[PDB]
Amino acid sequence: VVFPFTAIVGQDEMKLALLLNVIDPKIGGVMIMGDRGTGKSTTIRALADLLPEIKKVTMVDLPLGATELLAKANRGILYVDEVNLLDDHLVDVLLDSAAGRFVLVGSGNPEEGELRPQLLDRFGMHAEIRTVREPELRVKIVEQRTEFDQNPHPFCDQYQTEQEALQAKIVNAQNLLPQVTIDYDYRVKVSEVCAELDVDGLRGDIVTNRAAKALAAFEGRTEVTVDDISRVIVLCLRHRLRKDPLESIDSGSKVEKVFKRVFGVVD
Amino acid sequence: VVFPFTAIVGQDEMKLALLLNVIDPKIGGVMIMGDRGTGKSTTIRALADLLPEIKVTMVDLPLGATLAKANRGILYVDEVNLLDDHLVDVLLDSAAGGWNRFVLVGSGNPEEGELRPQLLDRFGMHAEIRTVREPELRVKIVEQRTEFDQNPHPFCDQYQTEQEALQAKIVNAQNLLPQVTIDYDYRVKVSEVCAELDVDGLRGDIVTNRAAKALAAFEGRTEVTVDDISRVIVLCLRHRLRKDPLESIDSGSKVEKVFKRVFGVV
Amino acid sequence: VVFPFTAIVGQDEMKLALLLNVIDPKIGGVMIMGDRGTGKSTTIRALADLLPEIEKKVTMVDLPLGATEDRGILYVDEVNLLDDHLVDVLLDSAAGRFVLVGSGNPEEGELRPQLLDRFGMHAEIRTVREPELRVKIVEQRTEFDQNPHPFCDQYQTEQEALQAKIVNAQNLLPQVTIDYDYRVKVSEVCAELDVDGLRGDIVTNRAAKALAAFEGRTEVTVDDISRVIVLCLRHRLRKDPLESIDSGSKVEKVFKRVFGVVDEALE
Amino acid sequence: VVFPFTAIVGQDEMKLALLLNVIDPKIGGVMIMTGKSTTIRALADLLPEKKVTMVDLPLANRGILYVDEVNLLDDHLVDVLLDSAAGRFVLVGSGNPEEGELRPQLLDRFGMHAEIRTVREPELRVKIVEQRTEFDQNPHPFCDQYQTEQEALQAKIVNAQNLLPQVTIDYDYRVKVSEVCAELDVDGLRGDIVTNRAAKALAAFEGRTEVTVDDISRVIVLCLRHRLRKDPLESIDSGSKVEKVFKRVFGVV
Amino acid sequence: VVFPFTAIVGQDEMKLALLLNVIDPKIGGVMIMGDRGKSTTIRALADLLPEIEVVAKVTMVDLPLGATEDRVPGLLAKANRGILYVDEVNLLDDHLVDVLLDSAAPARFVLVGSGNPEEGELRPQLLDRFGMHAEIRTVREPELRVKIVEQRTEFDQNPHPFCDQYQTEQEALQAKIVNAQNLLPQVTIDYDYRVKVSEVCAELDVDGLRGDIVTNRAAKALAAFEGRTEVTVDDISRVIVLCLRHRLRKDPLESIDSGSKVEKVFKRVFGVV
Amino acid sequence: VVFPFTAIVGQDEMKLALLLNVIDPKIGGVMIMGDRGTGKSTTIRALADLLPEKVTMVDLPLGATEDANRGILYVDEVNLLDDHLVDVLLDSARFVLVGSGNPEELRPQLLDRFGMHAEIRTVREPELRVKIVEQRTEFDQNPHPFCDQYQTEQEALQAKIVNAQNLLPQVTIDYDYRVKVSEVCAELDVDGLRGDIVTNRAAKALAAFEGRTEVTVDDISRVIVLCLRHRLRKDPLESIDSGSKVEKVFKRVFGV
């Protein structure tokens, strides 16, 4: 038995990136660079255990150096725990196999050679993990972990209806995605943000659109909204920045700043 | 089936470099520097699919150690930054500038190496790819890509007469090139531009002349015009600059400035 | 015969780290970095000899320089060498049973940040600065080398008093509670120090309870947290290199702020 | 078949260095820093006598040896070749900037240092290009257009070699040449010797037996510009300093 | 025949370090750093000591560049009741040095080592285990330099006539060494002095208590050498730089001589006028 | 046959350093740092051909081995093969050690072990440079007429060397001079007493060469830079020539 996904607290940005990829695997996978390592392996297992069967969904790990495990990985999840030194070309093929049919998930180690700029831009979204800063939230996690370690089944049962409610929303979102439309004016202003961010190519334009539709589908709507784009654009474009080294500005803050201007958002 | 060449939008400078080399392979090949994406590989496949049957053969040569007998074809070196055997690169340049005849195309990695003035001056033209900055154009490109991915054959058919029209223009330009002449005054003012740019050698003089003749041939003319030279001279000379490091001036902008002065464009 | 633990003078911070681990080994071990005129080899030997009999005495096992892979105390004299592979395996035996103790050399390879965070506490040894104490250590040391048995007898009842306190602390540890407000303020200190993960939260809580148990109390006190929090978090700092501040001094500074500890200015 | 030597335009300084070495190989070879590989074969094809053979060193008595990249092939191999020269064959070397600038102890041992500057006259650049393609299209009609000029220069080379033993330099000139070497702080007396051997070879080339101030003028930059010991505090061109000191010592208005 | 120890001029600080180790070998050896009469002084000290028996002359053992435990019978045993000179202890780093410091920290000996600057400073963990740090400064008195040279040629020409000229001084110094060894057990250091010695070590931020011990063993040995049984402030003054200057942990912001820093702090703590 | 020693012009400092070592080999050899190409190997051959009895010059190559006396040993590049082979040669010096080196420098610890440091500067007088070259080709064309032109001067110099060697035991230096020599070494911060000894041995050898048995202040003057300039411990904050510093301190101490 694995820690229930709906009980993981304090990782909202990473749970969003994983949920949107389950809804639209053509987003291109998630690169998880949480320099603060905490709840990385167990979150991805919780999400696999949460998905419905169609045979149960299978999660595959990227260990060893097999040249070629994409066999048992179709219509599933593939986790490469340390893709910071995993060959050099095998990474290229997996990023293609995810953008045309599985959920690519990658993790890295800080100070071991930060993702080479040619292989990180091909990742759909870039989710960073920062350890929870709210004190009473940190206490709740610790109190939850020992409470789970002592009595797994009373814990998993406590979240049983919340897991099923989220399980149905994933299915509904997958079913509704074909009807989800984004207005032309929004689709254009998304590209304006990609241009003003000096994104290398059009992949950033493509992922933001696929992500915004997948989020709107998740929330049971068929028209992409300005707020829908707001919640996915940092995940999609912050690792696609081409900023001058003379700038001390946060990448995620640069995308939010440019997004708010182009769309005219007052916070 | 491959994305049609005549549908590629926003890469005009590179499509020009590729078309001129297809018309006169003795130009010396194309070095493609710029955005990694923007389908550099797929444009060259599209151009191969467009050429007439004399089908033309497209060569990969990816990370190898000595695939070079496809004469009157195209050779794409995706990462000629990792041909640490410079001797492989050097022979491919001279053979491209003669019949040993093929269209050399190479791509490289910025900030990794190579690009050494000895390994860059021998490329005929230097085509730079800048990703489109106009928002509605980016949307149009994206809307075209999946439209091709969902229905390849209806997309290729929409461009079928334009593909055949461009195919006839390539053959015509190849056939007309022998009579294309350049005025002596232009030929001298071109050399004045190469000298005033302090280009290393006379190869820049040679490529600019061959490019201007090929462009006029493409457009069904037999007299090279100042506008013909205008459209090729940056492709030919910007990677042949010997500018002082004290200059914050764009290389391509330097070539345009000196061309305008020597020829007197106002 | 071994030098008696209750006779060691001038290592209070390190003796505290060892005693609390003996009381609660799930704290995660002690990393001993510092000076050489102490004898981390004989203080740990003294602590094994001080513990109660296990049925023979508790076994102290030493790991020499050339050491290949292969309820007591394990002393790893040089955990700088013996690459991450061997070091990783030992940390598993700890955490959630033996007291891991490691020592290191300065300038022989800085604390590997990923393998140092997994040590429970970080005790630094500073050689005694009080002149009359330095004389006392030397006079005691030669006095022990000439007549071990007369020396150990001078400290035999004090060894038994400390031995009973250790057992009492272990027996009482299950009833030891920490107030919710303290538990949250401990996590607030961990957050304000930007600690990597929640491991710092857990050992500080386990350490404060073990100290309160050592002193025969069942309620963790602000002062109880004060005496263990530097041992627990100073090697868990992520401070900017632009700061010339001592790590242990940074933990005390943030601890006093979060808990609001100030000196009464008496007339 | 090779492009004729007498048709090469715009390389006068390098053609002078090569002709003088062919006349007196004891000068010590040429360091060449637009296609010098064919210029040296053009010179090989031009010499008399079986025909002289030009040898390439990619990894030869009484001929020509061209070391294309004397920056690589470490001092060990380079040292050995310089012995064959000096006080007999024509050593020719070229070098690459940024590839291991020729060690200062290994560059001084070359007789002359000829620099190639690409032609700046527009109508000349056009003429060179038309000459290359005209040669590629019809080599033999090209070589024939230059056949009598090739034979004329071939006779001058033979005569110059035959006349060199009688060529003399005035004592006052020979001393002022040494003053130029001393005022330049040259490493040793090799500059005094090469400038003397070069001035005599040039005078012999022109059918004369007395070295002239003008003869020295035309050879002294080739001989001394790579032998300078100037302070790095000088933004002054090396070749211009040699002319400047030459003009002072000899008194050229 | 070897140059007589009592004739060596201008090495006073090193002669003091060597004599005290001969008097109390538990001091821990001498590290000789400085200008480059080093190999010849130690043999003279070996030649000066009184002739010993097999097991209840003193033997000098050297060590060339090649060690690799080709000493552990070998060479470690020939140093029994003798002296071991390590000519270049800045090379053969790590293990070989650690083993020798252990063998002198079945044969006990006076460890003496010399090193080369710029070719490696002995790793600070293995230099602190040397008892004392004696530096050799070449004599600056001109008329003294002439005497040293003139003594060298005078000895090279007539060894035996030279040794006789110093023979009674050798016997007097030999008797003082034996007496000092015999008197060492009674030599006491006052508690107030013993504490102020530790205060100097602390104010110098010395690594450990080894400096406290060496200064005390050295002060007693010097007082014993001079036929006294009470350590004096001047006794401590003459050994404290030998004992602590290689034990400094000084900030790199200080252009102060290490040996000179010890003198200043010693004068401060003890109140020397 | 080799170019005669007495015909070499413009190398007076190196000819002085070599002659004194031939007279008193215990001086410790010569380090020749001539930043100019002037035929260092052939001067040493010229000096060997000049000595009586015949003589023998060994020339060590770059590739030293693992193993000559009463002769001359020339180490053309004492930079290579320096770890131990250079160390071994300085120990064996009975023969006249001669070494040359190229800048871009021997171990500051292995250069102090050389007796004297003679620098070669290329002749700056124009009419002299011409004469050297004219002498070289004239010798290459007619060796025996050239060597005969210098034959008696070679014999005159040869006899002076024999006389100096034969007279050396009687050569004395005043005590006041000998102390002032040591005072110069002290103010130069010389490493050890090796500089004091060579300056004394060199001054005696020079006085013996000139047929005298009492060292003169000028005798010390002409050798002290050869002996002490490579034994300096001067601050890097000084833009002063090392050889010029020795002259400065010598002039003060002796009062010249």
* DSSP-assigned beta bridge partners for residue F32: F100, F118
Structure token pair of residue E115 = 């090193």
Does the CA dihedral A225-A229-A231-A232 come out positive or negative?
positive
Torsion of CA B205, B206, B210, B215, to 10 degrees: -20
Buried b (16+ CB within 10 A) or exposed e, F125-144: ebeebbbbbeeeeebeeeee
Count CB-CB contacts under 10 A for residue C164: 11
Strands E30-34 and F96-100: unpaired
At residue D100's C-alpha, the angle toward residues D94 and D103, to 5°, is: 80
Question: What is chain A's length?
Answer: 267
Kindly tell me the sign of the dihedral angle through the C-alpha atoms of D102, D105, D106, D109.
Answer: positive
Number of residues in chain C: 267
Residues 6 or more apart from E273 whose CB is under 8 A from it?
A: none
In the structure encoding, which two tokens stand for residue D162, read together?
């035959």
Neighbour-count burial for F148-172, b at 16+ CB within 10 Å, e otherwise: eeeeeebeebeebbeebbebbeebe
Alpha-carbon Rg for chain C in angstroms:
19
**CA angle, A82 as apex, A81 and A88 as ends, to 5°?**
130
Q: Do chains F and E touch (3 or more CB pairs under 8 A)?
A: yes
Whether C35 contacts C14, CB under 8 Å: no
Phi, psi torsion values for A14, nearest 5 degrees: -75, -35
CB contact under 8 A, D122 and B201: no
- CA-nearest residue of chain E to F194? E149
Closest Cα of chain D to F111: distance in Å?
22
Secondary element (H or E) of residue E156: helix E142-157
Residue appearing with tokens 């003399």: D168
Resolution for the entry shown, Å? 2.9
**DSSP classification of residue A128:** P
Residues B76 and B70: their CA atoms lie apart, in Å, by 12
Sheet (strand A59-61) strand order: A59-61, A77-80, A103-107, A30-32, A125-127
Residues A213/A180, Cβ–Cβ less than 8 Å: yes
CA C41 to chain centre: 14
Contact (CB<8Å) F175/E146: yes
Cα–Cα distance for residue pair E4/E6, rounded to 1 Å: 6
Paired with C63 in beta bridges are C76
Cβ-based neighbours of A101, under 8 Å, separated by 6 or more: A25, A74, A75
Is E198 flagged in the annotation as binding?
no
Angle between helices E12-23 and E167-183 (to 10 degrees): 50
Burial (Cβ within 10 Å: 0-12, 13-18, ≥19) of residue D16: buried
What whole-number distance in Å separates Cα of residue C59 and Cα of residue C52?
11
From the list C45, C118, C199, C234, the catalytic residue is C199
Structure tokens at A170: 């994933």
Q: E83: which strand partners?
A: E60, E110
Contact criterion met (CB < 8 Å) for E149 and F197: yes
- Owner of token pair 């300065």: C106
Closest by Cα among E92, E88, E95, E80 to E25:
E80
Of E141, E106, E144, E109, whose CA–CA distance to E28 is shortest? E109
Distance CA B143, CA E87 (A): 81
Q: Which residue of F has its CA nearest to E145?
A: F182
Residues of chain C with Cβ-Cβ distance to E196 below 8 Å are 131
Q: How far, in Å, CA of E184 to CA of D15, rounded?
A: 92
The residue among B11, B24, B27, B15 whose CA lies nearest residue B236 is: B27
Residue B265, token pair as written in the block: 């464009």
- Is A36 one of the annotated binding-site residues? yes
* Measured distance between the N- and C-terminal CA atoms of chain B, rounded to whole angstroms: 46
Q: Which residues does A91 contact at the CB level (< 8 Å), separation at least 6?
A: A83, A119
Whether the Cβ atoms of residue A83 and residue A199 lie closer than 8 Å to each other:
no
D230 Cβ contact partners less than 8 Å away, ≥ 6 residues apart: D184, D185, D236, D238, D241
H helical segments located in chain B: 12-23, 40-50, 86-96, 117-120, 135-150, 152-158, 160-176, 184-196, 203-218, 226-237, 251-263
CA-to-CA distance for D17 and A101, rounded, in angstroms?
Answer: 70
Give the whole-angstrom CA distance, residue B59 versus residue F23.
Answer: 79
Chain C contacts of E213, Cβ < 8 Å?
138
Q: What values do phi and psi take at C66, rounded to 5?
A: -75, 80
CA angle C219-C222-C223, nearest 5°? 100
Whether residue E208 is annotated as binding a ligand: the answer is no
Q: How far is CA D168 from CA D165, D198, D203, D210, D216, in A?
A: 8, 12, 9, 5, 12
- What's the CA gap between D213 and D126, in Å, rounded? 36
List of long-range contacts for F62-67, beta carbons under 8 Å, 24+ apart: none
Interface test mutation site (partner C, options A42, A81, A107, A131, max chain C beta carbons within 10 A): A131
Calculate helix-pair angle for E210-225, E191-203, nearest 10 degrees.
Answer: 130
Distance from CA of B263 to the nearest CA of D (A): 13
**Is E38 part of any known ligand binding site?**
yes
CB atoms within 10 A of CB F76: 19
Per the CB < 8 A criterion, the answer to whether D14 and D119 are in contact is no
What's the token pair of residue E252? 């790199």
> CB distance from D77 to chain F under 8 Å?
no
DSSP state of F150: T
Whole-angstrom distance, CA of residue B213 vs CA of residue B20: 9
- Rounded Cα–Cα distance for residues A195 and A211 (Å): 18
Q: Does C216 touch chain A (CB under 8 A)?
A: no
3-state SS, residue C102: strand
3-state secondary structure of B184: helix
Tell me if B37 is assigned to a ligand binding site: yes
| Residue D46 structural domain | 1-253
Interface size between C and E, measured as CB pairs under 8 A: 43
| Count of domains observed in chain B | 1
Structure tokens at D48: 């008399």
Angle between the N-to-C axes of helices B160-176 and B12-23, in degrees from 0 to 180, rounded to the nearest 10? 50
**Closest by Cβ to E35, choosing from F182, F185, F191:** F191
CB C225 within 8 A of CB C241: no
CA–CA gap between residue C29 and residue F204 (Å, rounded): 76
Cross-chain residue pair C187–A136, CB shorter than 8 Å: yes
Nearest CA in chain B to A191: B135
CB A41 within 8 A of CB A156: no
**Alpha-carbon span E25 to E23, nearest angstrom:** 6
Assess contact for A25 and A102: CB atoms under 8 A: yes
CB atoms within 10 A of CB B264: 8
Report residue D194 as tokens.
């090469």
Q: With H, G, I as helix, E, B as strand and everything else as coil, classify residue E55.
A: coil
Alpha-carbon span F183 to F189, nearest angstrom: 10
Q: Which DSSP symbol is given to F224?
A: H
Minimal Cα distance from A185: which residue of B? B136
Q: Which amino acid does the sequence have at B181?
A: T
List Cα–Cα distances, B103 to B48, B86, B94, in angstroms: 10, 19, 12
Rounded distance, CA E136 to CA A62, Å? 64
Residue from the list D176, D179, D188 with its beta carbon closest to the beta carbon of F36 = D188
DSSP-assigned letter for residue E235: H
Cβ distance of B195 and D129 shorter than 8 Å: no
Answer for the pair E144, E11: CB distance below 8 angstroms, yes or no: no
- Give the number of other Cβ atoms within 10 Å of residue A187's Cβ: 22
The C-alpha atoms of residue B59 and residue B39 are separated, in whole angstroms, by 16
Coil/strand/helix, residue D56: strand
HSE-CB at A180 with a 13 A cutoff on CA atoms is 25
Does the annotation place E39 within a ligand binding site?
Answer: yes
Say whether B116 is catalytic.
no
**CA of A110: how far to CAs of A114, A131, D148, in Å?**
6, 15, 75
| Token code pair at residue B227 | 């506008």
Q: Within 13 Å, how many C-alpha atoms sit on residue D48's CB side? A: 12
Using left for φ > 0, alpha for ψ between -120 and 50, and beta otherwise, residue D98 falls in left
Residues 6+ apart with CB under 8 A from F181: F196, F199, F200, F203, F220, F224
Dihedral Cα A96, A97, A102, A105, nearest 10 deg:
-50
For A66-83, letters b (16+ CB in 10 Å) and e give eeeeeeebeebbbbbbeb
| Bridge partners (DSSP) listed for residue B124 | none
Q: How far is CA C98 from CA B206, C24, C95, in A?
A: 80, 10, 9
**E-strand spans in E131-196?**
132-136
Cβ contact, residue pair A131, C197, below 8 Å? yes
Scored b (16 or more CB within 10 A) or e, B18-31 reads bbbbbbbbbbbbbb
Report the Cα A122 to chain-centroid distance in Å: 13
Cβ contact, residue pair B138, A205, below 8 Å: yes
Residues of chain C with Cβ-Cβ distance to E209 below 8 Å are 37, 127, 134, 137-138
- Decide: A82 and A107 in contact? Cβ < 8 Å: yes
Residues 6+ apart with CB under 8 A from C189: C204, C229, C233, C251, C254, C255, C258, C259
Of the listed A116, A130, A187, A203, which one is catalytic?
A203
A142 in Cβ contact with A39 (< 8 Å) = no
Amino acid letter, residue C155? Y
Q: What residues pair up with A106 in beta bridges, in sequence order?
A: A31, A80
Strands A103-107 and A125-127: what pairing? unpaired
Could you tell me where the DSSP H helices lie in chain D?
12-23, 36-46, 75-84, 104-107, 122-137, 139-145, 147-163, 171-183, 190-205, 213-224, 238-250
Contacts of C3 (CB under 8 A, 6+ apart): C42, C45, C46, C141, C144
Q: What is the 3-state secondary structure (H, E, C) of C201-239?
A: HHHHHHHHHHHHHHCCCCECCHHHHHHHHHHHHHHHCCC
Query: Which positions in chain A touch B37 (Cβ < 8 Å)?
Result: 200-203
C-alpha C3/C-alpha C46 separation (Å) is 6
- B47-84 burial, b at 16+ Cβ within 10 Å, e below that, comes to bbbbbeeeebebbebeeeeeeeeeeebbbbbbebbebe
Nearest to B188 among D119, D120, D123 (CB): D123
Question: Within chain D, how many helices (H) and strands (E) appear?
Answer: 11, 5
- Phi, psi of C62, deg, nearest 5: -105, 140
